[PDB]
Amino acid sequence: DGVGSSSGNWHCDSQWLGDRVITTSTRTWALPTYNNHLYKQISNSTSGGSSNDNAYFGYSTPWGYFDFNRFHCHFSPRDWQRLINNNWGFRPKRLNFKLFNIQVKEVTDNNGVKTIANNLTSTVQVFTDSDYQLPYVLGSAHEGCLPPFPADVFMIPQYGYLTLNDGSQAVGRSSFYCLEYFPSQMLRTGNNFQFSYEFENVPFHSSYAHSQSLDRLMNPLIDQYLYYLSKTINGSGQNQQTLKFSVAGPSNMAVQGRNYIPGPSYRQQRVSTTVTQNNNSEFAWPGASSWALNGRNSLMNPGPAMASHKEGEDRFFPLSGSLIFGKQGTGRDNVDADKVMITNEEEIKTTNPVATESYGQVATNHQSAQWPTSYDAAQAQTGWVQNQGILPGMVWQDRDVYLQGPIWAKIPHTDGNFHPSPLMGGFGMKHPPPQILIKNTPVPADPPTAFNKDKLNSFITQYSTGQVSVEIEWELQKENSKRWNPEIQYTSNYYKSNNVEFAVNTEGVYSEPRPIGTRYLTRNL
Amino acid sequence: DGVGSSSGNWHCDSQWLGDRVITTSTRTWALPTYNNHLYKQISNSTSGGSSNDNAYFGYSTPWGYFDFNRFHCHFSPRDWQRLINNNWGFRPKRLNFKLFNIQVKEVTDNNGVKTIANNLTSTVQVFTDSDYQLPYVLGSAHEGCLPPFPADVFMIPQYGYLTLNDGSQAVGRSSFYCLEYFPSQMLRTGNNFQFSYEFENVPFHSSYAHSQSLDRLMNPLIDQYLYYLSKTINGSGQNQQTLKFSVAGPSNMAVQGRNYIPGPSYRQQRVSTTVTQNNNSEFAWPGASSWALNGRNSLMNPGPAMASHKEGEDRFFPLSGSLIFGKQGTGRDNVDADKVMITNEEEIKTTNPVATESYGQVATNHQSAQWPTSYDAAQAQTGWVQNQGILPGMVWQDRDVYLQGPIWAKIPHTDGNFHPSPLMGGFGMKHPPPQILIKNTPVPADPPTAFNKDKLNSFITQYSTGQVSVEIEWELQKENSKRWNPEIQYTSNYYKSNNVEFAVNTEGVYSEPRPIGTRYLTRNL
Amino acid sequence: WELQKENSKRWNPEIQYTSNYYKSNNVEFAVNTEGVYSEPRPIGTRYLTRNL
């Protein structure tokens, strides 16, 4: 408080240490009044008659929340380049959050002209759901995060949640949460808020690509001591059955015995960026490859981590198996392909199956020769495996993270799960960073001079602004490779252009021209 | 004071311990200027010519008071469910009250447009009547309590009181109280107010229902060693008198000797919710069953705790023997039955008489046989007992408390009383939680430049707002029943509906759909 | 047996297993006139609720 004194400082930089990097980000926010200080029941019926697949029931709250669950909220593009070009892995360790320099403004709109003035006695309520007693919405890749550019001023998003629904109706098991049922303190002028949190133990993210394929792990000079069936008939035919075996064999690497097999798969439809190569029909929902839950079909959005395309064809992408980001200024309804940025997980093709291909073939009958009678005899038949679950001896790589991608997600509190790495990429934790809720305290207008028991519905128009600072410490996994030839590194292009990539244009608009992965260095196996 | 500092915090939650539960509630209030800073004499004559039963004389004060004498002011609906489904009794122990974040606003209404601005130098006066030297109005089930929903902003009610009256006139014994005759302190900017209070020893509220009836406490297998008169004549007649006695007797449980009898009663008229079953006449006052005091008739509102109806008929309710709450949004004059919520004390039918039935029968003469002369002989006659006072060996249950019902009441300071449990339900104390009075300090407008002895009657239009926090610690009485079969518990209905019970609707209006009692668990005797 | 307590912040009441008050010839989970004990229905364990 006061002209000569502040309640907070700059705090925007990145410190690089031996095996640690500390990122600090500071932004200025604006928080309006949401829902006119009311809790409102919402459902699909309130927005027209939709399909059963899109039915929902929930509540909208007058609270707002802070979101920094994206990598660009903490790493500058140059800092991201340092991270991915020199480290085999990384993971968050602890975070520090600060709220300071609160300013509450009141707005009067009389006879057209609008006037904004300070309201020194107003308050802003902040609390953290450190016990995870509220629905968690930070793991759904929603907008409203801290802007990647530090100079941008952003709007705090409104907090809402969903519960159980039967169509547009609710059931007795549905839960209603009031955020005012959490501790409320009395504040004076000039206060600040801060808290700390420690990330639970998570595995390092694989920020590397494999220099070896799963089917090429053998010595290309030495035979195996195992045999494979190589011939079933002598050729010609009447009764020419036989059994011949052979050694494999660098010349027959396909039939060699192996200890491990590629990870699981779930077939996705293949779409070409060359529109003339696609079928002349409307297939976005019909060929979507989805999953069902309680009679509702939900798109198999990215899903299991699978290679986006086969080698030598980057023009193909799975229908809903890849993260698709929008370019700066891109609209929201029916935009062209040049307005969106489609990621591809081509690095994991060494261990994961191709998203648009079958996992393999399996036998579907018993081949048999003649034996008594004739029609009984049948040749060997095989069938395509379009979806394959986990099998012992399987290995796979998880989906890559991106500069514009999410960081963490909350593992659902269930009896069981398998490999709870979030399917959109990142670190899955049972106790992620808690949600931080914020709201302007309502200030009623002049009440009537005669008592009335009805709740007040006339408030002073107010909004608040301030600064938010988040600092995260990351642990680094160094690389000690013995590779002789130079590695692949992310780099800018020297060729001249009208604008500098990852900068502002003439109008002052910051833009990220392309997605940045983390898998540039290489390692064996 | 100041933007960066507050004078109070969140403080809104409930803590459950072994045998204690602590509830904390925080609300935002608004306090206008009442009565233009004047004390005004009020009477029934000021509101037209009413009947003698409604005559009164009193004063209206420019002060306001805080009311939290309702259970929903401290317990959330889910917290109420936890209390009543797991405990045999409860009682308050101590309370903590806080007032903070005071904001005083001044209003100017020139040429139509209204402007509201801060008045940093104004004050608000608060004091507690800890010596009970003022009339106590918190035990009359008045509106203006803390809203059940924490997000609602409420208006502080105006304080008024009554004294002795003769019609619309006063008498020499009437008392006039000035609230400014209580200690007044000088305040600076940014102050807060708080105080503590300890509840006096009160009995636990019976939050249970009896699994046994008062007339079925015997062993149904063993006879009694007592005899009862069973026959007075042999039958036929001329002179057939005799005296025959019998043992009772599981087959004659009605005539068995008993040690205790049902509690007192006061007959109430029976009204059916099926309007076609009621008499086609206007009977609300004529058949009201009231009591008189100094020539004034007052309705016997709920009165002695009695069973609302006999078993197998919930369509009947006593005329004024039950608490009737209004649904959300219900009007105040001549509303239909579907707009109100009628409670029923059906649980206490095991020990208390039915409100709409006679207590029993009593003998009203001396039966006699022939003896000299003839007309003297008379058969036995009995009369109905419509009202029965306390008798030795009587047992009864008090009226149940509700989530929307009152908590406590002040026992009148008289020479004597019997069982001073409030008739509307709750805990009766000689020294209840003291009244908390609050008022905006008057700020005069510009006075004339020439002295004038008359009191100033021109003040700046002001109102105040702030936050209020009340915390109450409750003592719990656990249950140790040996009942084998499951008990009856309060529960929500799973069946789908447009809105969630005890939540907000689409418009953001909170509503309580039904009254909640406390008697769900069972115990013997 | 070790117990795991619930600390939910759900506002509306939960679903609980309860007996039916409606009158009947026999008490559920008790003996009949002949003295035969019987369990009238299966009882699960999933009545309280939690997120995720």
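qc> The CA atoms of residues 102 and 171 of chain B lie 41 Å apart.
qc> done
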